[PDB]
Protein: Chitinase-3-like protein 1
Amino acid sequence: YKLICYYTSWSQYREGDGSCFPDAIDPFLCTHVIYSFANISNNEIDTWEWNDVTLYDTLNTLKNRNPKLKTLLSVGGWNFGPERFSKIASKTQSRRTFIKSVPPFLRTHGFDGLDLAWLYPGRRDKRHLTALVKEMKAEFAREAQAGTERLLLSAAVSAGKIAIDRGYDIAQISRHLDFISLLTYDFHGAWRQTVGHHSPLFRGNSDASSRFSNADYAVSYMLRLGAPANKLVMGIPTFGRSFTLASSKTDVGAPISGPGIPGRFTKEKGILAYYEICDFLHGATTHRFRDQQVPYATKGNQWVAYDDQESVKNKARYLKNRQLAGAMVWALDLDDFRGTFCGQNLTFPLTSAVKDVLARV
Ligand SMILES: *[C@@H]1O[C@H](CO)[C@@H](O[C@@H]2O[C@H](CO)[C@@H](O[C@H]3O[C@H](CO)[C@@H](O)[C@H](O)[C@@H]3O)[C@H](O)[C@H]2NC(C)=O)[C@H](O)[C@H]1NC(C)=O
Ligand SMILES: OC[C@H]1O[C@H](O[C@H]2[C@H](O)[C@@H](O)[C@H](O)O[C@@H]2CO)[C@H](O)[C@@H](O)[C@@H]1O
Structure:
């Protein structure tokens, strides 16, 4: 089993204990660590933060302690406009340029591969995403003739049916990618005025209306679409999604006024790190959807849908029974990396819970 963990660039700026550098990453925790978000500039891969070449270096020294570790650099991301990828992909001149620029960059900084995080290709992009992958992998084969090891190529793919039908030729791209991370955790959108969980494992009862918004469906769907099971990796989140209630209704379907208030460290409307959730639990009422097999909580007018040790071990067992390649954890820096926020004694409680199940057969 593979355990793919993303580390985010901007987490260094978090205040106090929230600050996180590659430094804190247990090198024996994951099989692949993905340094998150390289920019693309002048149609060539490039850094994003002023000190990336330093953190790049910091992350890859982890490999000196665990020579089995594999690292990748993700290009694209949530603050990299999708129209920008589009321009690059749909114009072969600029596409060959981006591709030719990649190997040297990775080799120079000690990475073992590239992760494409084109956040959502549209109807008019499908044919092009396929070319980018096909050609990018082709370039990777050639570059291995130099006697060095073949660089790995991966993609972070939407787990929403409409999104999947719209922009990906999964039968094609999966025959060329080394693995595919299914973004199975951003299901309840950014658009409802109703309370819901962003990562149910299963479908459930109250949900007679939005039927394919759970991990089980996404998986089954990728599978019948042509993706081999051993190239599929199911994303497990380490963050929670908050909501500010509009009535004293705490249960299923209650109305909301908007996203939840910002975490003291994470400073961002609608999102809380698991370590922020851990502090949030004291004084909160914890509930758990039996159907979807995921928990949520409430205090005053704050409703939080998150993942805990149990639900994460569950998603992990599922992944094993359907025989997937492994799990992906979004944000090593959103988990309790210091291990001094969540009561239990461990470092990275959530990610460790996944490793344990992956390792137990
Ligand atoms: C990611 O790459 C982006 C390039 O695709 C880049 O945005 C752009 O480049 C700079 C901003 O850094 C802006 O500025 C200009 O610099 C020249 C050099 O002196 C000036 O003579 C010109 O006035 C020019 O405008 C660009 O306007 C901007 N636009 C584009 C289309 O690239 C970002 O800087 C990169 N993002 C990060 C976070 O590093
Ligand atoms: O630089 C990109 C931004 O990434 C985050 O966004 C949420 C994302 O919108 C959601 O789809 C995903 O499931 O989780 C991440 C949590 O990391 C950051 O919260 C932003 O601060 C970043 O700017």
In short: The two ends are 10 Å apart (CA to CA). The first strand starts at residue 2 and ends at 8. DSSP finds eleven helices and 15 strands in the chain. Residues 8 and 254 are 33 Å apart (CA to CA).
